[PDB]
Amino acid sequence: NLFETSIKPCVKLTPLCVAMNCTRNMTTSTGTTDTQNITIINDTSPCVRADNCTGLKEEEMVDCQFNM
Amino acid sequence: EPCFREENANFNKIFLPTIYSIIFLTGIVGNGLVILVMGYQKKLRSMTDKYRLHLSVADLLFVITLPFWAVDAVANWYFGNFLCKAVHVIYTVNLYSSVLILAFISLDRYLAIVHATNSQRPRKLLAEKVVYVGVWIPALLLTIPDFIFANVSEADDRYICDRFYPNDLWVVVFQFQHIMVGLILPGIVILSCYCIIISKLSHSKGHQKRKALKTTVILILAFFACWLPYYIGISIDSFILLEIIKQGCEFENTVHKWISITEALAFFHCCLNPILYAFLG
């Protein structure tokens, strides 16, 4: 109840399968060679502060249209 | 990179006030001597001299206020907002109007050599009535943004008098329009003027006579030689602020130090009218 009342969702969803047409926008980013060297990265590293440091991939987002 | 930084190098912190002070005193002495021998005495002879009076007046109202920059190069601007606004607008009007009248004397020599017969009243027209509307009026209407945006700022410790803009693209819009009105279009206008001057002077090699062009030639060559590295520096700073030539932070810091020393070198452009007058060249 605290979770539902504190942060209100913009969209509330109930279980019902609805047919819809969806397009696939492929966010393709090529990875380089995997480096196995250890890097104990702390908060004082230069990559975290610029927020340009190597993290997770960009997952492919999907746009869908539906009439309800 | 973690971040970017501001840092003035230690050598120019003493070197810039020396150049500023020497050009200050030779500017006030030369401009004062020129105005006292010419404007107060009305002892001028040719039509070029009135343009030299205008150069001296604009040079004065640059050079007496240049010691405020000599202070603020090493110290903090605890003077005021209005003083910073005033020194910036007068720096820009004396950067513009000198090039404007330097184009005007090239036009005057163009009118002198080829239209030597069918223009006498146009000389006094373009030396008396056209000058006010075509020199100071454009150089004042181009200086609205440093009247209306200029302000002082306390950024951390430092009281800074410096040209401040809402975003980065206004800076490169100013810099591109600045180089194109300060060097480029006077470049083509003056270059065409002297090209036609020598092209029709070559028709009269049997009658050389005057050779009074040499004063203006030495003036335009020295002025462009003083101001050109400042223009290429601000072009490089514009190109790095369009982020097309990115290499690193310390390259742009060296660009900043280059800008400081080349503006200091470009301030030599003050004492070219009175030194050439004293040499009678």
UniProtKB/Swiss-Prot annotation, chain B:
Please report, in chain numbering, the residue ranges of the motif Important for signaling: 108-110
> So which residues have sugars stuck on them?
151
Tissue-level expression: Expressed in numerous tissues, such as peripheral blood leukocytes, spleen, thymus, spinal cord, heart, placenta, lung, liver, skeletal muscle, kidney, pancreas, cerebellum, cerebral cortex and medulla (in microglia as well as in astrocytes), brain microvascular, coronary artery and umbilical cord endothelial cells. Isoform 1 is predominant in all tissues tested.
Q: How does it sit in the membrane?
A: Multi-pass membrane protein
Region Chemokine binding, annotated ranges = 69-72, 88-92
Q: How is it modified after translation?
A: Phosphorylated on agonist stimulation. Rapidly phosphorylated on serine and threonine residues in the C-terminal.
Show the stretches that span the lipid bilayer: 14-38, 53-74, 86-105, 130-149, 171-191, 217-236, 258-277
Q: Supply one GO CC term from the record.
A: cytoplasm
Q: What is the effect of changing residue 151 to A?
A: Enhanced coreceptor activity on R5 HIV-1 isolate Envs
Positions of region (Involved in dimerization): 110-122, 166-185, 241-243
Asked whether the keyword Nucleotidyltransferase is assigned, the reply is no
Kindly report the protein's main subcellular placement as a broad class.
membrane
Extract the ranges annotated as region (Chemokine binding, important for signaling and HIV-1 coreceptor activity): 161-165
Instruction: Detail the disulphide connectivity of this chain as listed in its UniProt entry.
Output: 3-249, 84-161
Question: Which residues bear the site annotation Chemokine binding?
Answer: 146, 263
What processes in GO biological process is this protein linked to?
apoptotic process; brain development; calcium-mediated signaling; cell chemotaxis; cellular response to cytokine stimulus; CXCL12-activated CXCR4 signaling pathway; dendritic cell chemotaxis; G protein-coupled receptor signaling pathway
Print the keywords alphabetically: Cell junction, Cell membrane, Disease variant, Disulfide bond, Endosome, G-protein coupled receptor, Glycoprotein, Host cell receptor for virus entry, Host-virus interaction, Isopeptide bond, Lysosome, Membrane, Phosphoprotein, Proteoglycan, Receptor, Sulfation, Transducer, Transmembrane, Transmembrane helix, Ubl conjugation
Compartment(s): Cell membrane; Cell junction; Early endosome; Late endosome
Description of what induces expression: (Microbial infection) May be down-regulated by Human cytomegalovirus/HHV-5. (Microbial infection) May be down-regulated by HIV-1 tat.
Q: Which family does it belong to?
A: Belongs to the G-protein coupled receptor 1 family.
Task: Tell what the record comments on domains.
Answer: The amino-terminus is critical for ligand binding. Residues in all four extracellular regions contribute to HIV-1 coreceptor activity.
Role, per record: Receptor for the C-X-C chemokine CXCL12/SDF-1 that transduces a signal by increasing intracellular calcium ion levels and enhancing MAPK1/MAPK3 activation. Involved in the AKT signaling cascade. Plays a role in regulation of cell migration, e.g. during wound healing. Acts as a receptor for extracellular ubiquitin; leading to enhanced intracellular calcium ions and reduced cellular cAMP levels. Binds bacterial lipopolysaccharide (LPS) et mediates LPS-induced inflammatory response, including TNF secretion by monocytes. Involved in hematopoiesis and in cardiac ventricular septum formation.
Q: What else is known?
A: Plerixafor (AMD3100), an antagonist of CXCR4 activity, blocks HIV-1 entry, interaction with CXCL12 and subsequent CXCR4 signaling.
Q: Which disease is it linked to?
A: WHIM syndrome 1: An autosomal dominant immunologic disease characterized by neutropenia, hypogammaglobulinemia and extensive human papillomavirus (HPV) infection. Despite the peripheral neutropenia, bone marrow aspirates from affected individuals contain abundant mature myeloid cells, a condition termed myelokathexis.
Q: What is this protein called?
A: C-X-C chemokine receptor type 4
What organism is this sequence from? Answer: Homo sapiens
